[model samples]
Structure formats: structure tokens, C-alpha cells
Target: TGSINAVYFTNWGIYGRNFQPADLQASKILHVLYSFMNLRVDGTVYSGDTYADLEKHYSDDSWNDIGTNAYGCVKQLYKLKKANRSLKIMLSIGGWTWSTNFPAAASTEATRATFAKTAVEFMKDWGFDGIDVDWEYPASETDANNMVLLLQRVRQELDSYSATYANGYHFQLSIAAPAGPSHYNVLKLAQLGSVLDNINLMAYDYAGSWDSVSGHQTNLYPSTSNPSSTPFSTKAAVDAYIAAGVPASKIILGMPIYGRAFVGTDGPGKPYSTIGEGSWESGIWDYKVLPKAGATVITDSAAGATYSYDSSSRTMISYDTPDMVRTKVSYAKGLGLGGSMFWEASADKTGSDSLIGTALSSMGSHDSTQNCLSYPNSKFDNIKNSLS
Candidate 1:
């Protein structure tokens, strides 16, 4: 009842995935992070997809007379908020494919100002309550420090915008953080913690098709019997973040709704010949489409992990089941973590069998307060006028 349930809603999902904001359960979630807003080479942030983000019209949307009304997913999201007052929508910027320009943009003070102001403006213009920076693994210590400065700028601009409204509209700031030590070790966790409302620990993808051997992609603990099966563990990452001085309350545990597969492997910690085929990419499977026909679901409580093995096909797909999610929910609650976040919304199943539903119901209660809703300074006629 006291944790935050957040999910990433992909803007492009409406294409082949056919998922939309209207398909989401706003009652069960506290935050919906829209992925993503693009970064311009000259240092401005803009909506990544104009049609999907602002212009695409749904059947419910009007083709008739209207005064600057917005459509597309963002419009659907705002309307979703009207029905569920507790839901907060945030703009997530710079995921892996789009993060190449971040290092350059965050290098200098002049660029940081432009980047920060533009980011905040983008959030407001799009009817978002906050921004979630997803600069996938800032490469060096210098880049890490620059990330801190970037968020600071973001916070300041967010506050300045709120000041105009004269209400305590605290616009949230978050980051999709890394789980692997090699990537997170360079980060100034304590500094990042101070300026952020939620440090969403991207706790999955410890191993995948890129690995030399097949292992648990999102195990909560390292396997004692098979060390090779666990390249990394969520326990280690959580401890490291806390030791580095980030308050546990600001950490949001991330869960993957998809599984990483290994083909022609004997079992966990073993060699694999290939990682063939997936829902959208090779060696990955959506949770809803998991446990292939001949597969046997296996749970290793010792490692705090779950997976499915098809001896017939010599296939293994490491992913979280409902039980794994329950274990994770307990792990978060025990550590006083802020909330739970999913890599995406589309991959999950619905109702009682849903991972999201399981965690939210297990948490008992959660943060339900409305976030920043006033965006009087937005450039969009509809966002500025409607949100105001």
C-alpha cells in the first residue's frame, strides 16, 4: 500500500505491439514513464515521434470541431489521468539507441542549461508530471558526474516552472540506472540520489544473447552451487547502491517483463550454441508468451530466480514468474525501497495472473497522490491551455 508501482509505456508499441495508454490499468500504478523523448545534436530535447506522441487520432478522438485539442498516446494518457487521479505520467529520455548524443550534450555548462531547460519544457509541453533520464550507463566518471549536474539543472528548471503556479507542485525527476557493477560502479550514487525522486534500478539483463554462457538474466541472489549461473545478482546491486549512500527510499526496483533465452544449452551456467528467435529480438521472449510448449518451469529459490527449460528442444529462458515477483516485492519492502518498476507495460499479462497486479496487491497499499499537473508555460496550445 505504500510502494510506487511504475511502468514504462513505449510510444512505438502502438505500431506492431498494438498497445496503447487506454489498454493500461491506471488504478494499479502510480507512475507511467513514457519512452522516450529524443535528443537533438545541437542540444535540444524533442518528442521522438510526432504522430504517436501528439497527432495520431484514435476512434474516440474528434475529427470534427475542436479548439487546439491534442490526440495520440499523450492525449490518451492525460485522459487516463483524469479518470485515475493518482496516476502520474513522466517523460523518459535517451534509452540505449538514443543515448549516443548525451555525453556530448552534457559536457559543458552552456549545453547543460540548454539541455535541462529544453527537457523540462518538453515534459510540460507534452503533459508530463516529470522526466526520467535514461542515459544508459554514463561511460566514464566524468560522464557520471556530468549526469548529476544534468539532473540538478532539470530539477531547478522544474521548480522554476512550478513557482509560476505558486503551488507546491513538486515535479519528479528519475533515472533508469544500471544493475551491473561495471556500469554502476562509476556512478556517484549518493549525489544522484540527492536530486532524484526515484532511482529506478534497471535490475534485469545481467545476461542475455550477448553473454558467452547462459545464466539468470535477473536473479535476486547469486547461486552458491553454480556461480557461473549467476553473472550478477540484484542483492549485490542493492547493497552497493545503499553502501554508496543512496537512501533506500529513493530506489525503485526494476523488473523485466520479458525473458532471455538460451538455445542448445544443457542448463544454467552452461555453454549455449545459440539464442535463436524471440518476440521482437533474438534470444528474448515476452512473459506472456513464455514456457514454450515442451518447457518445464523451474524455480531456484536459493538463487532467487526462475526459468523454463525445454529438454526436448534444449532451450532455456530465464525470466521472473509470479513467485519471483512476490520474492522481489518482499525484497523491496524489507529493504524499505520506494517502489517497483517494470521495463514495459505490453509484455505483462492481465488480472490475477499479472506480475504488476501481483506486486501491487502484495504491497497492500501505495503512493496515490497526484503529481505536477500545471503546465501553464507549455508551447502546445492544448497542453498549455488544457493542463492550466
Candidate 2:
């Protein structure tokens, strides 16, 4: 399983903007990342000052680009080369806002080739192991046409890049795709999977402000008791990815280190009637916040989704805790999918021991899905998914 499974760290260098700047040092961060998880570092940019800011702060020098930031991280990782764990760092491109340029970048042979060259050069310079395209979405309503062209170009570029590193210092390629069939046509995804190493199925954010109803951010399934339900879920996302041509072994399911909280509501021990929208705010607690807050862990018998409800302030939030994450990990194994991925390591458990740490600790071994009920998923040898 070690060969197939890996963990991704993108949101760290991107939106959350934590990790490299947090309490953890780059070396310690590298150690934790390499201890049980193969590393995938993302630092791509399409617009704004973020790209330059990140480069100045995290890269070896100011001249470094997005690729350089990623390369620097991998260089730090080599310090733990003697560790038992094997690591594969991926350079992920495109995200929520950065995706707008994909179609134009991919429309022409020259641009595609240039993109490919840059990607290859970055990988070579930083010694990154591979690449993952996080297009956010493709055929879905948000921006369908753009992704279609973007993906076509990405695969075109990756095809050439993959060969450059074929000497066992493999340069694998993958993508971060949506869970719902509505997001992208399943048929198109199948085509993309054919050219890529894996597909990271982002099952979270099924419930958010964009959605009409309040729901779980990452529920295994949907709860019948809840008034609203989402088309997204662990089961649905996996099935969607697999059906779209991504082999179960090539699908890496995503999990969030931070839970979404909704303000405004009522009394304790009572169901929250009035709920605010979801926010990406990171709090002090880890995933353990759910259990500690005394939120409701309602299991949807049919959908297999679990959610926690807070009585006070009429606020109800749905997310994973240590126990719920255990179920999700088991579900991935049961489905025989690639493995699991985390959104942001910085937002994960803090201190020496917390939810994320405890969960990892519970895994008897550092291997993928290793005694998942207890540490990391041990599918590393069996599955072929990596986070981005």
C-alpha cells in the first residue's frame, strides 16, 4: 500500500497561509510529513500578490517562483531521507481563483509546451516527485468551458513531463476533481484519468454558502434527519470518480483538518433551528473540536453521513472528529480506493498530541491505512492516490 497512498499539503502554502509560518519549523514539518505520509506540496498562482509574497517568504531566494517554493520544501524534506518512510512531492497547479487562466494556457500548442517546460523545469530544480492539477472543477456550472480546455492542455503537458523523469525518480501526474457528476461529466473525468496517475476526490465542501441548504462539509453520507442534503459525500465522490474512469485505486479521498463553524443559534441538548453559513475560519482546536463542543454526531443510516449539532445559538455544524474520521478512513479502505488526503497540515491538530496526532497515533503503524482505527491508512502499497 505504501507505493500507492500519499498525503497532500497545498492549502497550507495557498489559502490557509499557515504551515511554513506556523509554530512548526520547516525541518519538523518535513519530519511529520515524511513520517507517515508521502508529501505533495502546492504553490501555484494565477493572479494577485500572493505568488510573489509566498516566494519571498518561503523560497530559498526572491528570484524563486511558485515552482521554487515547492522545490525548497522538497529540499528540506531530503533532510529526513534516512527515515523509513518514502516521500513523493507533487507540484499542484490551479485552485479556486488560479484556475481562470487554464483554458487560455492550454488552448495553444506554444502555451501548452511552455507550461509543460516550466512544470518540468520546476520539478527538476526542486526535485519534486510529480504534479497534480487542482482545476477545482470542469463541466460543472461554475466555470465549465474553462476547465475543459485547461484539462486538455494539462494532460498534454503532463504527458511530456512524465517521460522526463522516467528513470525511477518518477514524475507522476494527477488532478483534484469534484465529487458530484454535475461538477464535471463522468465521461470526461474517465478520459482525464486515463492520462494521469490518479484523481484526488475532494469530498468536503459539499455543504457551504454556495449551497442553498446548510449541510455537512465532509459527511460520509447524508443524514435523513437533517432537512438539507448535499449531492456530495464520501461515497458519492468515490463512486463518481471511479465511474468517471478513475480506478478505485487511483482515487485519493480528501479530508479537512479544520472544521467549519456556523454562528447564530439556541439552547444546549436541542437541535439548532437557525444556522448561519459556513466559513473557512481556523480555530484553536483540531478536529477534536466537534467532540469537545458537545456537538451532535448524527449518523445517516442510509447515506452513512455523520453530523454534529450544537444546541446553543441554534448553530449546527457537520464535520469529522477523530471517531468520524476513523469511519471515513475505513470507508476508503472498504471501497479499495487509492487513499486519504488532508487539506492543510497547519490547520491540523496542535501541541504534541491532538485530534490529528491522536488519530495518526492510533494507527499502529506509520504505513498507509495502518490500523486506521488506531494511525495512517496503510493502503500505501495498494493504492495510487496522492493529495494536492
Candidate 3:
């Protein structure tokens, strides 16, 4: 009966970002999806970053009690769950890089069966509450259909495991879905809803350096001025799935805790001859560093997005602000959607400035506000202040 407020905890974040599982414990999020576990074509699962996942010892004094080993993150997450029983954690498989093998894995019944079986075993071994499938996309008609078949197989296996277990808790199965019409076209939305507990609609990256013109990366609504690009909007995508017969209750609106950068643009809706620089990677900047890096924030009422434009360097960054997140959350709530989720948790400057905090505040009042508000924690304090 509870609405989900989730966020992705990237494996690489523990490196330069220094985002730890303990940070997640301080955030307002109830569900934490540890991102980017790889899948082999043979259906076996493995870690993409062994050093970050299980090797590097985070010997920080803060995590000293949790053990300084590489697997400390997972162990820390498990320990966090013990402290806060409401927390739900899952291992997400097949991100953009790892998704190439999905079409092959889902191509046949044998492969699907193997993948599903291994997934169950993998979840159990890692002490995760569930599995989240993140197939970047399915290209052909056959691939799309096979994607559903794979999900069905996984759901069947998870159900079977739940039935066999002495405990009543069953593993949850979710998916990171597409926002664009083209990606959603190949997917069987109704069939996916039947299998997945929540369909996380990736509502960001609507525009980036890929395009010649600047536009809101994750707008709540479509912009008439920027009509040339592919149709991408939070409302549009959500309505598309519902139109395809997916219930609103099963859809989770996705928001970005980062922004898309562009060069050669003085302002929003301006065309650039070339792509701009990124704070991290080309055309990408984390929310925490975007402001400090010299991007001036601006608001667009019609599009329902917040963007940062740097006039001096002609650099622009399209990202969601606290207000924009509240709007999206309000829209989702108005539509009776499940909840909201963000890409990564490490991007926020601190708790008072957390994008996830804005999301949780919009969702509803929960114990997170109580425990997080008073605690001397950055992530938690960010959420608490955002709620205030």
C-alpha cells in the first residue's frame, strides 16, 4: 500500500564521488537499487566493477566499523537494512553498456530460463530484496517480444522462489523503461506491467549535446518551441504507457539528479554549431557540481523544467530543480502513479540540496522526515529541509 520513493546507488560512486551506502541510509529514499551488475550472454551474472563492488577497502574512519573491504558497500547496505527495516534494496542488472547482451539472452526460451534461474540465485546470494532489469532497449520486433518473455521467465522464477521459501516475503521485480516513443514502441507495455512490480520510466536525457539545439532534458510537459526533436516528456511517456494499457499505479516517474550540458548556446532553445563540455563526461554534469562550475539556473514555466545557462562561455545545462521535481511528483500523484526515482544519489552537494529530498518531500510524509530532519547527516538533512 506504500508508495515508492527510490534512487539508484551507482557502484562507481564510491570512488571520486565518495558516496557510500551509509549516505543512502541518511537519504529519504525507501528503495535503493544498486546499479549496473553485468549479465553475460550465457545468462550468468557478475559485477562490472570488482574492485568497487568487492575489492577496494574503504578504510575511512566513518566506515571503520562496517569493515574496510571492497564488499563493505554491500555489507554496509545490509547492515543499514538491519537498522532501518523499511529499506528495500535490489541489484539492477543490464545498464546501457551491459544491455547489448540482453537481446541474445532473451532470444530463446533456454537462455531466458537460464537467466531467470541465475537471477534468483544471484539475488539470494547478495541478500538483495529483488532484481531490477535495465535493458537499454530492444531493437527489433522479435527482440521486444523476447524482452517480455524474459521478464515473464524472471517473474515466474521469483514467484517460484517465494513459494518455496518458508518466509512470506517475495522478491520484487522491476524495470528501467524508456521515455521516448521509439523505445516504448517495441516493448509490450501491458505484458511488462503484468510481470514487473514497477516500471521506472527514464524521463531524463530528453535533450543533450546530441542535438544541435538546446532543450529541457527532462521536462514535465512538451515544449512547443522545440518541436523538432523526438517526443519526450514525463507526462507524454506516462500517458503513453497508460494508453498502451499499463496501469498508472505500476509506473514510477524517473527524474535526473544530474544535468545535460551543451556548448555554443547562450540560452534555452538556442542552436549550437557544436556540442559543449561536461563537468564530468562530455555533455553531462552532476547536480552537485553544476552550480559551482558556473552554470546559472533558469526556470521555464511552460516546459516545467529548470535549466542553467552560462552566458559567458555559452554553456547550458538542462536539469531539474527542487520546484521542477515537486511539479513532476505532483503530476505523478495526480495521475495515481506509483512514485518517483532518480538515476544516482551521489550528485547532490549535500542533504540540504538533495534532489532526492525534493522527490521524497513530494511523495508524502514518512519517518524519513522525522529521523532525517534531526540527524546531523548531509543526505538526510537535505531531504528534511527540502520537505520543510
Report how far residue 379 has shifted in candidate 1, in Å: 3.4
Models ranked on TM-score: 1, 3, 2
Residue 199 lDDT in candidate 1: 93
lDDT of 3 at 62: 40
lDDT of 2 by residue, 78-182 (tens): 323323234455666766656656555554556555566565554444444555766554543324443445455655554554544332333467677777656
Model 1 C-alpha lDDT per residue in residues 140-171, reported as the tens digit of each score: 98999999888898888888877875265888
* Candidate with best lDDT: 1
Worst 10 residues of 3 by lDDT: 369-378
Residue 234 lDDT in candidate 3: 79
C-alpha lDDT of all candidate models, in order:
0.87, 0.49, 0.74
Count of backbone collisions in candidate 2: 30
Alpha-carbon shift of residue 241 in model 1 (angstroms) = 0.4
TM-score of each: 0.97, 0.69, 0.88
For residues 1-388, write the lDDT of model 3, one tens digit per residue. 4567778999888877878888773446667888888888877767788666554554542434332222446656655665665667777999877888898889887889999988777565455678899999998989988988998898888777666641446568899999988999889889998878889889988887666677778888877866643246777888889999998988988889888876777576778655545655777878877664576778877777888877788877778888788888888889999888888888865655677777777788532311111211112222212212
Q: Say which prediction, candidate 1 or candidate 3, comes out ahead on TM-score.
A: 1
Cα lDDT for residue 72, model 2? 33
